[PDB]
Design a protein around this ligand. Structure first.
Ligand SMILES: [Zn+2]
Ligand SMILES: [Zn+2]
Lengths: 197, 197
């Protein structure tokens, strides 16, 4: 029943997210049983990743270059910016192997329920990328959560002042889904925004 | 191992989808413990259901009369016809509680593999409905499936000879979904369908 140096590893493991008490408890032990090196590997990593954390110059992404392989390359149109939230979104998006523009990660979303609001999210710096208006279109592709929508709903308030196209990601019926199992809200959007064949 | 009257029920039930042998067993005993009269009411509904079933002469939906309780009602908008694949779809779409038009059931999708061609689903009646009626809008609400796509794109060539607005249900991100787990073909459309503001 959890001696010190352990009632903290736990205490601090169970602050990581998707890590319940259960888990911080279970997980902590496996750890004390790993061979020393392994723990030092683990530990170093947790701290090396942080000591070398590279933020993109243009797009605030987390590549290992000062300027991301996406923002470098001269085929990518630095004039359509695709807003997102997470380094991970960016990989998702590039898998559609169709995007031409460049990204702007914000590193989260605006949920006054997790510990956040405009400041902690790279919005301030997004505006400055278009302050000169040498971007034709922003594409705000966060999630269609109340997460995503907050942020988007009004990032697009702020991009009003500038001479830009502020397009939002399309909402509707996923492909390979069918109408019989689709939510009533997904459905009404799908319906009231019908893409005139 | 159970009685023989009961084997049968079990079995018979187990052929209905969504009920496996644990459940085909459970309901078998529940059913046969309720009063005779209730037990007779299922038995009854089950039978009068199938017997009484008919399709409307206009939209080919499943109804009880000659004309869908929808088309029989004359203050819905007979201008806009919401093509849709199956009778259960119309139920979906109707629970959305916004569409004011009328349907046309096709009863299937052009499916070279099933053997079903275009003259095997109520597609012609649709032309007739639209050639002879005064039709403003012919919404296509088939599924985003491969087969369901082909269909809506077949019907839509047919309808350009005529002078009508052929719209399609919007394909995109299912509301309250996430970018990380949405698949690429949905994404590439979410993004390609992007809409201003
Ligand atoms: Zn970059
Ligand atoms: Zn009808």
């Amino acid at each position: 029943y959890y001696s010190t140096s352990v009632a903290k590893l736990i205490e601090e493991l169970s602050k990581l997210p998707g890590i319940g008490p259960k888990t911080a408890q279970r997980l902590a032990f496996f750890i004390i049983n790993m061979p020393l090196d392994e723990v030092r590997s683990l530990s170093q990593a947790i701290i090396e990743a942080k000591e070398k954390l590279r933020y993109g110059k243009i797009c605030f992404n987390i590549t290992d270059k000062e300027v991301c392989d996406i923002c470098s390359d001269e085929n990518r149109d630095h004039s359509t910016i695709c807003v997102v939230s997470h380094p991970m979104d960016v990989v998702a998006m590039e898998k559609v192997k169709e995007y031409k523009g460049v990204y702007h990660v914000l590193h989260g979303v605006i949920s006054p329920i997790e510990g956040v609001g405009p400041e902690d999210i790279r919005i301030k710096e997004l505006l400055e990328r278009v302050r000169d208006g040498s971007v034709k279109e922003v594409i705000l592709a966060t999630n269609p959560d109340i997460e995503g929508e907050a942020t988007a709903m009004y990032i697009a308030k702020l991009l009003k002042p500038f001479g830009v196209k502020v397009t939002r990601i399309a909402h509707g019926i996923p492909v390979g889904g069918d109408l019989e199992y689709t939510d009533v809200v997904t459905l009404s959007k799908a319906l009231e925004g019908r893409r005139e064949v």
